[PDB]
Amino acid sequence: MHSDLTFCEIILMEMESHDAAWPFLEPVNPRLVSGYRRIIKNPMDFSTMRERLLRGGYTSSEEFAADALLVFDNCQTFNEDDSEVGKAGHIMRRFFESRWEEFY
């Protein structure tokens, strides 16, 4: 489990400092985005994964992968592919699948 959680730390750090990460650093504010609360049932963002990972609330790397994927699934549910946020989500998702697969 040590190697699981430590690569989780690596990939999370790299997502946090990635150029295209700007939409996903903090929770979406439903007051600012019309219709978000109604459409996205389980919001997720990199700072929430950071909190949980630091507290140790991820038992395996698979749950960490679940939260990251949830970030990008929400992104694609709410945002147009050609929107700025959608484009950044695609760069970040491709990034994450890529970094995940070259380890596991």
Ligand SMILES: CCc1c(-c2csc(CCNC)n2)[nH]c(C)c1C(C)=O
């Ligand atoms: C379009 C709003 C949005 C942002 C957004 C736009 S601007 C910004 C600054 C955050 N501070 C680093 N976040 N992100 C996500 C995941 C959004 C949606 C609706 O899915």
Ligand SMILES: [Mg+2]
């Ligand atoms: Mg999926």
